[PDB]
């Protein structure tokens, strides 16, 4: 925890069944390929209405993962 | 799609059962009277607590609909 | 209060005598023609200076009114 | 200019040929039907890429027009 | 309603089951100890992912309650 | 002034007679019970319209007061 | 009006008697020395409380004035 | 369209000939190497002035592309 | 970690020797009296210049602490 | 480059022929009288519509120039 | 303190040795030529990396100074 | 410099010894693996307090690097 450095990527998750779906739907695919999803932050909740009655919630989130080598989980000052 | 122009209105949807409710509750009434709801954007999630334990989620959204005559769905450059 | 949906419009009120004037001057005209002004939110206080010494305060506000049919003032969850 | 009150609407103009196009393309249709477009403010410049190489610039703007009766263009304080 | 003054506090509610949970989970504890929760406003929806698949939604909200003595619910101008 | 630390609270003041009223109406009650109001910052000017013609300006402000013991009013670097 | 270019300066006006005072108090001194104050925009309304009961409203505004030579008031496209 | 998840990257495009150039200049290189640029959003228009008279417009944009496998273009609720 | 709810307070720390000082100077006093400072967020770095050459950095931060009873550090969904 | 200090001024450029015009029209006049325009940042794109069909794009930008004496272009740490 | 009016200028300070350096490096040059620097506000902390390992922190700040004649330090309402 | 296009990534640097540490700690690891870090922008300064007295400053920054082939450093308009 001395020089742990993280990276934040932004992904947009989409689900016709809610915001908690899109959050989980997108966060999930992200992990299918990335390392250590540690946190997320929602930046927008938007959406499209197809057929006028089918919303496809589109939630944009910023997700953060550790890139630095698993190193000493320490405090050094 | 050459000169399609849209209009954005802002509506606040309210539901005691969630944010996805208010979004759908309000978006829905909006369509009862407007043309071609194409998209929406959430701007705020607020709420009132009546009886101290009854939240009435109030979600404000900006909704967008086409005003321009259905015209050539085209690309011209 | 179960599915009450509101609409927010934005108007700019102007008065040479203050911000509370423009707020009331504009909000007032808005009601001359709209239904149930319930709330307002100020977004900007700007102004022009004519003759260099005559400010015309221009206050932009977002005003909200009920569109949904007067329905049950109720809580349903 | 004592109690002149204005209204601001938001429209999204779109053009495959630029931002100044979409601004003018949308502002123009707006006037086809509204009164006294006096000003505009850009809020976003976004866009879609169809065929991957055809951008359709979408510029969202807030446009303002006078609603109050043409009245004394005056200063009263 | 003449000199009613309110106070706004900020709390972060957390739930592994959604945003509407955290909102209600946190708002609720807040009332366990405070007076007259009247309104709330969401400011952020964030979260941590433990085990990589267990999100703990963290919603930050600003909650508002009346401090001024229950006084005349009146309008005085 | 070396380690003087302050605290900022947020209060909403309300008055049917203006924004300068609500600011003073709320700031005042705040002092009835707190120590050393030193500054304030307005964050929003909102309002409700009862009877459609009775605005109750609601101004939200952040107020700051000293918590640290009255200590040396000094500069140390 | 073809190449009229303006400059915006920021000034903070202060008055113990209100926001409309500080706006006018500051805007005024600004003109004592500058050319053609044409517009202003409020950016903050803050304040200090001396004696705990004497607010000195401090309003920060951005003021705009013409620098370009009085030239053709024209439209050229 | 049920679980389509997207990724947003941010790129800065630069052109001495305009903002629509930099937008297209940068968006273009981005596609030279990425999949399915679907949308873009401008976040800043900045620039450097070399030789004092050569602006190099620098437009920062957020571009979004699909990462999820081309899957059912469907609505499922 | 199922219903852990937190509270965020805002404090301004001040030090003539830097921003990391004010952050630590203020955060520290805050703990002298509060429970479980878990996190902080900087919102502003401002300052006053006394004697014209003595800056007193004033850093405003939002600090967050747990209020809910130490309860099961668990995940429940 | 050790103690190079810059100053940022804000100017509004205007042109009936576009945003890239106003940017260049205004930036240009600014240099007619200032030293070393090094960079610019757009803050707003607004405009007035005279005759309803003559937009006068008004672009506000923040421009930055060096004030410190041309000194060692160096790195010192 | 009745009609004291201030002016805010924006300067960018730069130092290879930190943010507190650039703040002091720039604020300092500003005073070499201006009157009564009373306060400052940081707006951005940016930077360039020359040689890839030499950061030149660039901190932009808004600095405020009194322009109005030293007048009665008084409260008048 | 005609079509140089850049990419901006966001990383969070962490150090128990300051903000200038985390900035340098994170920026550094980023370069260990990326090309041409040219600039950075701070977006947040946050932090965790372990043991209540060990802050781990977490600074989030946006870093920008060139992706386009080293090409003509030129101006072409």
Domain ranges of chain B: 6-66
Cβ C37 vs Cβ C75: under 8 Å: no
The residue of chain D nearest to residue C58, with distances taken between CA atoms, is D5
DSSP assignment letter at B17: T
Q: Residue D27 and residue D39: Cα distance in Å, rounded?
A: 10
For K17, list phi and psi in degrees, rounded to 5: -115, 15
Number of helices (H) and strands (E) in chain C: give both, helices first.
1, 3
Tell me the longest C-alpha to C-alpha distance in chain H.
59
D51: closest CA among A26, J54, A46, H37?
A: H37
Tokens of K52: 């890839």
D9: closest CA among D24, D30, D33?
A: D30
DSSP string, F19-62: HHHHHHHHHHHHHHHSS-EEEEEEEEEEEEEETTTEEEEEEEEE
Comparing CB atoms, the residue among G4, G8, G68 nearest residue J10 is: G8
Place of tokens 């981005």: H30
Q: At F17, which helix (H) or strand (E)?
A: none
Q: Do chains B and D touch (3 or more CB pairs under 8 A)?
A: yes
Comparing CB atoms, the residue among B5, B67, B77 nearest residue D16 is: B77
Q: Residue F68 and residue F71: Cα distance in Å, rounded?
A: 8
Place of tokens 């999930």: A28
Sign of CA dihedral A68, A72, A75, A76: negative
Q: D15 and B2: CB-CB below 8 Å?
A: yes
Cβ L39 vs Cβ L27: under 8 Å: no
Q: Which residues lie below 8 Å from residue E6, measured CB to CB, with a gap of 6+?
A: E38, E64, E65, E66, E67, E68, F11, F12, F14
- In CATH, what is the architecture of K6-66? 2-Layer Sandwich (3.30)
Place of tokens 């306060």: K39
Comparing CB atoms, the residue among A5, A9, A62 nearest residue L14 is: A5
DSSP assignment letter at F67: -
Q: Look at strands H6-15 and D6-15 and give their pairing.
A: unpaired
Q: A10 and H5: CB-CB below 8 Å?
A: no
Q: Determine the 3-state secondary structure of I26 from DSSP.
A: helix
Quickly list H helices, chain C.
Answer: 19-33
Which residues is I66 bridged to in the sheet? I6
Report the residue count for chain J: 77
Tokens of I72: 């099961």
Q: Residue E40 and residue E60: Cα distance in Å, rounded?
A: 10
Q: Look at strands C54-66 and C37-50 and give their pairing.
A: antiparallel
DSSP string, chain A: --S--EEEEEEEEEETT-HHHHHHHHHHHHHHHSS-EEEEEEEEEEEEEETTTEEEEEEEEEEEEE-SPS-------
Tokens of F37: 């109001």
Cβ K18 vs Cβ L20: under 8 Å: yes
DSSP string, K4-58: --EEEEEEEEEETT-HHHHHHHHHHHHHHHSS-EEEEEEEEEEEEEETTTEEEEE
Q: Determine the 3-state secondary structure of L31 from DSSP.
A: helix
Q: Do chains F and A touch (3 or more CB pairs under 8 A)?
A: no
Report the residue count for chain L: 77
Which residue, among G47, G57, G61, would best test binding to F if mutated, counting the most F CBs under 10 Å from its CB? G47
Q: Residue B27 and residue E19: Cα distance in Å, rounded?
A: 20
Beta strands in G1-36 (DSSP E): 6-15
The Cβ of residue F52 has, within 10 Å, a number of other Cβ atoms equal to 15
Q: At C18, which helix (H) or strand (E)?
A: none
> Which residues from chain A sit within 8 angstroms of residue B22, using beta carbons?
none
Query: Rg of chain D's alpha carbons, rounded to an integer?
Result: 16
Residue I60 class from Cβ within 10 Å (0-12 exposed, 13-18 middle, 19+ buried)? buried
Q: Residue C17 and residue I6: Cα distance in Å, rounded?
A: 45
Quote the minimal CA–CA distance from C73 to chain B in Å.
12
Q: Residue H30 and residue H10: Cα distance in Å, rounded?
A: 10
Within 13 Å of residue J8, how many CA atoms lie on the same side as its CB? Answer: 24
Cβ D13 vs Cβ D24: under 8 Å: yes
The Cβ of residue D53 has, within 10 Å, a number of other Cβ atoms equal to 12
Cβ J55 vs Cβ G77: under 8 Å: no
**CA dist H72 to G19, H27, H64, H68, I32, Å?**
58, 27, 19, 11, 58
Tell me the longest C-alpha to C-alpha distance in chain L.
59
Tokens of G64: 């705009």
List the chains bordering chain C where 3 or more Cβ pairs fall under 8 Å: B, D, F, G
Q: Which residues lie below 8 Å from residue G39, measured CB to CB, with a gap of 6+?
A: C46, C47, C48, C49, G63, G64
Report the residue count for chain A: 77
Q: E75 and F51: CB-CB below 8 Å?
A: yes
Q: Residue F57 and residue F44: Cα distance in Å, rounded?
A: 10
For G72, list phi and psi in degrees, rounded to 5: -55, 120
Q: At F75, which helix (H) or strand (E)?
A: none
Q: Residue F19 and residue I57: Cα distance in Å, rounded?
A: 31
Q: Residue B16 and residue C12: Cα distance in Å, rounded?
A: 33
Cβ J59 vs Cβ J22: under 8 Å: yes
Which residues is I57 bridged to in the sheet? I15, I47
I22: closest CA among L19, H20, D27, A39?
A: L19
Kindly list the residues of chain E whose beta carbon comes within 8 Å of any beta carbon in chain B.
19-20, 23-24, 27-28, 31, 36-42
Quote the minimal CA–CA distance from H21 to chain J in Å.
11
Q: Residue C67 and residue G38: Cα distance in Å, rounded?
A: 39
Quote the minimal CA–CA distance from G42 to chain F in Å.
12
Q: Do chains C and D touch (3 or more CB pairs under 8 A)?
A: yes
Resolution in A: 3.0
Distance from the first to the final alpha carbon of chain J: 11
Q: Residue A16 and residue A45: Cα distance in Å, rounded?
A: 13
Q: Which residues lie below 8 Å from residue E33, measured CB to CB, with a gap of 6+?
A: none
Q: Determine the 3-state secondary structure of L24 from DSSP.
A: helix
Kindly list the residues of chain B whose beta carbon comes within 8 Å of any beta carbon in chain C.
9-17, 25-26, 29-30, 50-51, 54, 56, 60
For A21, list phi and psi in degrees, rounded to 5: -80, -55
Q: Residue G40 and residue G27: Cα distance in Å, rounded?
A: 8
Cβ J67 vs Cβ J5: under 8 Å: yes
> Which residues from chain A sit within 8 angstroms of residue E19, using beta carbons?
19-20
Cβ K70 vs Cβ K51: under 8 Å: no
Tokens of E49: 């992912």
Tokens of K74: 């008084």
- For chains J and K, CB pairs below 8 A equal 47
Within 13 Å of residue L22, how many CA atoms lie on the same side as its CB? Answer: 30
Comparing CB atoms, the residue among F20, F28, F31 nearest residue G18 is: F20
């Amino acid at each position: 925890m001395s020089n742990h450095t993280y990276r934040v990527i932004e992904i947009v998750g989409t689900s016709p069944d809610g915001v908690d779906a899109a959050i989980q739907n997108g966060l999930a695919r992200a992990a299918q390929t990335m390392r250590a999803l540690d946190w997320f932050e929602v930046q927008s909740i938007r959406g499209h209405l197809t057929d006028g009655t089918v919303a496809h919630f589109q939630v944009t989130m910023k997700v953060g993962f550790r890139l630095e080598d698993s190193g000493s989980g320490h405090h050094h000052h």
